[PDB]
Amino acid sequence: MNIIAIMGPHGVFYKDEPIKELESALVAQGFQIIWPQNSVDLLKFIEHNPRICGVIFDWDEYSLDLCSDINQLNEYLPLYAFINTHSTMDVSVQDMRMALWFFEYALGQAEDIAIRMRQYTDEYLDNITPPFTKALFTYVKERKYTFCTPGHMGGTAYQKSPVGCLFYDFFGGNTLKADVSISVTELGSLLDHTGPHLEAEEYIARTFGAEQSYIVTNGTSTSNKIVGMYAAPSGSTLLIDRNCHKSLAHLLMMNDVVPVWLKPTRNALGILGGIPRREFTRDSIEEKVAATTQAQWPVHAVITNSTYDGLLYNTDWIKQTLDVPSIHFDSAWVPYTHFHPIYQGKSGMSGERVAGKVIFETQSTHKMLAALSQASLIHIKGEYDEEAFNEAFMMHTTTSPSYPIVASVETAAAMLRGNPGKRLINRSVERALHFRKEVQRLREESDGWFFDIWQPPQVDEAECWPVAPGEQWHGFNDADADHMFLDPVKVTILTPGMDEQGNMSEEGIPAALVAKFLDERGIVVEKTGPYNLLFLFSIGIDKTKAMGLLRGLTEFKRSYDLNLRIKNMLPDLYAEDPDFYRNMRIQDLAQGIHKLIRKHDLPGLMLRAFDTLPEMIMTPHQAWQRQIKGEVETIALEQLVGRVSANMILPYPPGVPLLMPGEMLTKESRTVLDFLLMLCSVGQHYPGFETDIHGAKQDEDGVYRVRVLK
Amino acid sequence: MNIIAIMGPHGVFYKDEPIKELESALVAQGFQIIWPQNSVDLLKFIEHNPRICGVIFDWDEYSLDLCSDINQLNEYLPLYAFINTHSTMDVSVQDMRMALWFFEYALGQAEDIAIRMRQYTDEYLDNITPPFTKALFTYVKERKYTFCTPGHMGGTAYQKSPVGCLFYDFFGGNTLKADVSISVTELGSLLDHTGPHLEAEEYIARTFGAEQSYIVTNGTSTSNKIVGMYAAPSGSTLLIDRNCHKSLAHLLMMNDVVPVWLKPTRNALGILGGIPRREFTRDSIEEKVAATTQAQWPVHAVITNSTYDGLLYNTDWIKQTLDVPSIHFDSAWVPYTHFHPIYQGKSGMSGERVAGKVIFETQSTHKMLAALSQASLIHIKGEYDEEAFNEAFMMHTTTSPSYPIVASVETAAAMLRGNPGKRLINRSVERALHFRKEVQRLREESDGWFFDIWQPPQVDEAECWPVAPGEQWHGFNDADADHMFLDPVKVTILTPGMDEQGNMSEEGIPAALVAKFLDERGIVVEKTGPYNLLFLFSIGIDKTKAMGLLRGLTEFKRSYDLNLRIKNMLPDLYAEDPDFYRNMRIQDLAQGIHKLIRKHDLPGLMLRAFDTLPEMIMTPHQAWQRQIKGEVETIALEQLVGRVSANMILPYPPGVPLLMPGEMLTKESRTVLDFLLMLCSVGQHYPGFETDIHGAKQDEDGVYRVRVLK
Amino acid sequence: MNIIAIMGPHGVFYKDEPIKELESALVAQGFQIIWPQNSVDLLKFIEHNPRICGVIFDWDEYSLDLCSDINQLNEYLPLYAFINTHSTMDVSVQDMRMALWFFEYALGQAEDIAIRMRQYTDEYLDNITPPFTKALFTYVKERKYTFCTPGHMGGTAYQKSPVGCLFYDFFGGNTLKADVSISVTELGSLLDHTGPHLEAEEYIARTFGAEQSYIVTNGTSTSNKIVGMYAAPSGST
């Protein structure tokens, strides 16, 4: 933050000489001086360069032309207005939010003006910077306690080592110095939620419209367990989305609770649909209580809002309808809902309290917004026993917290604050839609096959496009209306291979092939299925990355139609097994893999595998008690029927739990095993296209084993 | 790493010109050239500057004088030897470990020599750098995957914000870029312990003499819970040191186990002594089993080795004697025992396996060595069910691990490796002893009162000085010999106030006064009691810091004897309450606080408070079940007798648990309450000298409340 | 291959300053910067100078006027397009064979952009350079086997002689270093037609529409005799 813009040659020494003296006084204070051509050039310079921290201009020449325009971009931006004798104040000044200092063109005034600019820059920074970070930065820069640990003291210990010196130089001083302890008493304590730490938590809770917010330094994986353990006593019944993150599976292994699963829907693609409205009604739950051994009325419920694929719930409907005292929205996917009105009545925090209920959102701040890994928030809307909740929090938090992680969580909030924050999301929304329109346009214009997007036939509107029963694009049968909506930011592309029905085509290009092509160009794919790929249009995503991906996709088709040798098109793939890939051409590779899917009837097997549930012999907790005594053994996957599984089995595809600890596959549910076996069989043919099943142990000879109770 | 040392003017153009050409070729590659005066100056330059990465010298002039001396400091240091026509190879070369390249003095050879120096520097770096860090650094520097998250991508998202740009600039690029995900597939996975991660874990386990090592990214606070939960099934009995860290108290709240406490000793000062030998004998344990409701034979035992005050156990004695299948040494204080032979048979990992037992050390790598906060190790010696142990590990680890924390844990090992690692600890030991001798010397030489160190009357030896029954310095009665030893690095200083017996003097200077004086000079105190202060002589501690503390101590006495106004000597204290401290002088402050201790008979009350245990009505787990249903209320501290406490109460002093969750103070154990009340009473008089009781809630009016069962 | 052409003064600091910072970052990497007058001057500069390995230009100002014209001369030529906020992608991009990187005008982006230009220049070179020559050049530049012959090793033996030093200097290092043996095992063998040598022969045979091609190192004078002797038994007509 050291670029000052001056706007203009005037052609008079009485004005120019004082500016020359000011240039010299500013260089003495180590400012860089920049000269925008005109008003437009300045506005773009401000818009693109946050380091622009001051503007000098003749008052009469620019004030009536600049003040409103600059206010719109940066309310706080230093203006240094030089007045004429006859300058006056128009009524336009009275109600505008401007930050103006008035200066005269005079020799020997530069020393005082330069000090005022420095002092005013600090006042601007002090206003916009958050309180804890401002204190932290001041300590790191200024402070010198001695007779103190840490013993390394700003990473001093690292510099005494040959490799240590390389390590120190790589990470830098700030990273080393930021590693502090509670010996810095003026910053208070995280664990106590005292001093500046309390100020930080209130800052966060205000920005996100929460009653109270906790900063977690071990990710939402831990945030879920803090909420979960405080909320679910042993021997209680919980309602849990079968579509749950692994951390909730681990929660079950750690807590003595009885799960009753909310049951999602699914289509032919193998994409998960929302928990239908009937799942929340008293009639459905009352019967589930009767059907669960020892079950009582649920004390706590966990709902994933939105779904991974961007299906949002009417949260007003759930809060009003669901007859459970404790409702937890795992909102790790939707931390940005408070920033666009399109999400009204579609987020956990939206609206007011629910009398006699406590409502939670847990959010993974990292890679959902911008924050360091392990940074997570718990947002509470309702009442908790403060002392008891803090005991639960301290039970899972170390006594040696990382102060940078804490600061990064607070600074993540600083990013989303103010008008620049709102203007960021408005920009990302417009770019997300723009890209969707370009895909649909290129699909219409191109000759023969092209990529398509899984969405309404027309998205000429800016909204979370509702799933309508009168539309076939989504491929769900008799969808509930006014229920599930498509988040614009969660973009799913589809590759040729399956019909509109969910029927199989003769010609197909498995998405796995495109994924390998994309890696040659250093493009990450978040999630892939048989014929789909997921991309996340974050705030970091600019027009360059969108065009790079868009052009990269047209280049894939270009090279594909050439029918290049895999050796030439995918050299990194070829290198994996030169003999296997010696004479294979790109079109044969696509046809060969599609043929395996066709022969194995993968889509049909995947549908039938998830249609009937494994039987819950005992709870995951009860089964883990046997495992604690080391009463497990490994069996081949083929010999798992009639055995009690000890681990969760999580196959990719379709990346959702298939078997839980305590469940047993029987003759009734043999299709489950047939799907898993098919994944291991199909996956053995092509180097680089290996099976991927979390919970199964692949042996050197390519046989799989699972753990079961003796 | 860019400083090259050249050693010499020769007075011949045939040698000098080629060196001039080499200087120019090296500057072109951005090396800095340094010229040590002679052999001694070079050795000091190497010793003090790890960035010295090459030495040029005439072979005949120096080889017989340098080779052994340099080998001793740096086995790997580049030598660029310039040969004469008649140079020969003495037998001294044959068995020495040297890294030599031979060059001729010739024009137009510099391009190839310079490339060889670059290539050889990389080969030197490649040899000494650990495998994962070398790959990580190469990725961070070189790599460019696109169509990837994280969305911020090297902190790009931060730069779009005004405050975000300040935040980015403060932390720097490397800190931002190092925030990665598993999308970087070539680095494998932490959670899977695969690829370079397995290589890193084997590197660590080898350096620390463990069977297997796990890297934990939530500190030893979490490492204790991973080991604890895998090790102690519900309804089992554990032996636990009453002198346990808070994380073990939290473990009890989280695990349904029945504690039987090992019972430490204590002296008049209130310093904890070791668990006597009788505590480990079958006779003592057999009776404890009979005395504990529902207890069976202990399945797992936890011992704190060493004690905080540096008492080490004969671990060979414990491993051989203790009839428990699972023994866990919380060795958070002694991670360095593998590096000095003085610790033989005094560490958990020392020696071999114990048939039919599993032995663990958990170590807080940070501030016990040098590593980032939250970095912790679990070391295992024996057999675990690998798949089951990893489930327990994954249950408490996030799905979004911090890659820098992981790298810092590995790099912490890199610091301790090789000959420089051994030469570091040898240096810290010699400095620790040197300081102890200077304190004892100044005590002998000075007129009247001076500081003393709590240790043997003579430490003219380098050893963990054994506590002998024929010595009175330690103030423990009938100490077991060949049992407890004083770690040289753990230095406790004492201030005047109490006799050798543990009797009270008329004159005294409470240590709290000295602690405030030390803060005026930016010296941290790790731990303080009524008349003691603890300092940790880490590897970061140099001779400058030792002298600063030593001089700071003599300055305190100098100013103290002047009897300066507190307003002048302790201006920051005076500012806290100008009216209270207006006319008070330093000697009156010391006398006034000592008088409160004398009147309140603090030492006597503190001894009696810990003599009789609160009664365990129910386990901390059973009591927490009632708290989960919100069946707690707050009572004044004064009204706690006959109530079931809900929280642990941890008073400072003496910083050890006084009451546990589930325990009840009765008329039998009223002294416990009297001590706590005395702490609140004595603590109310002096601003800056407030009561400090974790577990008690101080109200605005200075009344305290605790939580109890209804 | 080190001449970069930049096309234009814009009259705005927000665009010009970032280009100044880029000029400095590029000079640090030892690039020469050249400034063609206009589109025609650029096209002639490209046409006449194969060492032109990159072009910087404002996207909106030139893309619709340049992309087809440049594609016609050099499919592979680096373009460094600087975008405006409102820049869009016309259908003309979809089927054209372009090699585009999109950059923003921003301070402190030059280090990464300059590295991308270096990395992209290598990717361009790697695409157009033949496989064996690319490996050979990399060996000659990078490699250092010891306990090896030839004994002269990069013509070292020549430099020990008065006339030898004149001979070495006349022919140069590359000519001397290129004199290798089969000790460089990663290049395979000519006689065996193995490894990169087989790759080279297939490259040739493809370009000349042959079933199989052999590389002869004693001219067609010998090529005629190889074919002739294999083809004509004694006592035949």
Author numbering:
A (entry chain E), B (entry chain E): 1 to 710
C (entry chain E): 1 to 237
Pull text from the paper.
for the polyamine production at neutral pH. decarboxylases have a similar enzymatic activity. between the inducible and the constitutive lysine decarboxylases. interacted with LdcI but was not capable of binding to LdcC. abolished by this procedure and no LdcIC-RavA complex could be detected. led to an assembly of the LdcCI-RavA complex.
extracellular pH, and works in conjunction with a cognate inner membrane antiporter. excreted by the antiporter in exchange for a new amino acid substrate. that it is a decamer made of two pentameric rings. central pore, with the CTDs at the periphery.
